[PDB]
Amino acid sequence: HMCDAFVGTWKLVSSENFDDYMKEVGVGFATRKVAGMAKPNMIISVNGDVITIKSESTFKNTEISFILGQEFDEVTADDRKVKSTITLDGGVLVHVQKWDGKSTTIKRKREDDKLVVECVMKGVTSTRVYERA
């Protein structure tokens, strides 16, 4: 019953500061514009110890599967090749991505009926709110 409150299908309903977050990450202009326009659905499932997170939008469809605490290699939607580790910290899913001596963290947390995503790169934070589909 690891991650029960995260499991399901979630749809983006608001975003703040995402363009600036993507700039900080190094995403180029055209990708920022199309990715920032996206209205992704986040689909989270669990089977045993394996968690799967799918993101589907008109921009890109991606899928990761992982075990908490166990690093994996990821190609991100913006085509970075990163080494990722996802853990549960005090009920928050914490996703750290490392590449080229850089690091960014994506936190997913349940707050009321929402799933709130906080993306942090250095001093720039973007907050994205998802609701159940």
Ligand SMILES: O=C1c2ccc(O)cc2O[C@@H]1C1CCCCC1
């Ligand atoms: O993994 C990510 C993620 C997941 C959910 C969300 O709402 C925002 C997110 O931003 C990142 C990256 C997406 C693709 C573009 C670069 C940033």
